């Protein structure tokens, strides 16, 4: 295997997914240069669980999932095992036993617009918390009250998604961040993804 892992495609994608509709890219049968990601000044978040970031090029995995999406600066801390909040509860949930790295960086100059970028959505209402790696892309009117909605928006009958309104003059806590979550899978099978 002399296929150099297409991390460029994940990290430098012109378009990123909404967090409710988070994108998963399967990385298989490939060589991973993690060192060019970690040994840089690019990433304000680079947190690994069950593994060390200096050692990543020494490691072999069955497969690697790369999940990616945009959220607010203030929400990046919710992309971790054991976190609560709208994002962890209703949008993207890591399992307690997560093995992988959460990588984020400020995308203000790409994902903010004067007058606001409303492209990026998050789910604001849901009857219950997501299971780890559950993807809910439904847009059913959320019944807040005791009267049923029957698809009519009204009082206590809400569209369940809301837009971030990314403006380049927002406080950095409210500025967009691109997030990439790398899951390292190990099971009784040939490890397909390995450092150089």
């Amino acid at each position: 295997i002399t296929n150099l892992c297409p991390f460029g495609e994940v990290f430098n994608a012109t378009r990123f997914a909404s967090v409710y509709a988070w994108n998963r890219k399967r990385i298989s049968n490939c060589v991973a240069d993690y060192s060019v990601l970690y040994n840089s000044a690019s990433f304000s978040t680079f947190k690994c669980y069950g593994v060390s970031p200096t050692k990543l090029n020494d490691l072999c995995f069955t497969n690697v999932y790369a999940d990616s999406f945009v959220i607010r600066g203030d929400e990046v801390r919710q992309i971790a095992p054991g976190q609560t909040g709208k994002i962890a509860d209703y949008n993207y949930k890591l399992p307690d036993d997560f093995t992988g790295c959460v990588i984020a960086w400020n995308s203000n100059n790409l994902d903010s617009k004067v007058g606001g970028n409303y492209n990026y959505l998050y789910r604001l209402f849901r009857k219950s918390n997501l299971k780890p790696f559950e993807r809910d892309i439904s847009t059913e009117i959320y019944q807040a009250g005791s009267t049923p909605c029957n698809g009519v928006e009204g009082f206590n009958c809400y569209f369940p998604l809301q837009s971030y309104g990314f403006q380049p003059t927002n406080g950095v806590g409210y500025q967009p961040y691109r997030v990439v979550v790398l899951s390292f899978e190990l099971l009784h099978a040939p490890a397909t993804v390995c450092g150089p």
Partner: nanobody, 125 residues
Framework: QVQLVESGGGSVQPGGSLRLSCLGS???????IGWFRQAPGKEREGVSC????????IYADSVKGRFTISRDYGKNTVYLQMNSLKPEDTAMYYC???????????????????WGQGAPVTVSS
């Protein structure tokens, strides 16, 4: 997953020096450490930052050649050496830790996860 304990504050006259200390409960090896300062009324301001790699540092324009940041990995502490002190330096000083890429530095308070209790600095006109 770390706590920061500061020490080294105090009063001084203009041209005096102070040495701040940020001691980590857990390993600070993976963390960049930032020093922010807060004066009553004024906005919080990033003073200095050192990357996890210990060989990238940034400084606010007004403190270049006055303040030096350093870290001892062995002693798991970060230091702000504060020389040539001036009344404008009067503030509460806080160290903070973030976990970014090896060379990452910044003054974005929201990107920092852990904050020290804060050390007092008074420069007496």
């Amino acid at each position: 997953q770390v706590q920061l304990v500061e020490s080294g504050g105090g009063s001084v006259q203009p041209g005096g020096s102070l040495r701040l200390s940020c001691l980590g409960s857990g390993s600070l090896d993976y963390y960049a450490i930032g020093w922010f300062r807060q004066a009553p009324g004024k906005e919080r301001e990033g003073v200095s930052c050192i990357a996890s790699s210990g060989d990238r540092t940034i400084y606010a324009d007004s403190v270049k050649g006055r303040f030096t940041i350093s870290r001892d990995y062995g002693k798991n502490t970060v230091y702000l050496q504060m020389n040539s002190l001036k009344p404008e330096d009067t503030a509460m000083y806080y160290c903070a830790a973030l976990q970014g890429s090896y060379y990452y530095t910044g003054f974005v308070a929201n990107e920092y996860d852990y904050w020290g209790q804060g050390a007092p600095v008074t420069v007496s006109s």
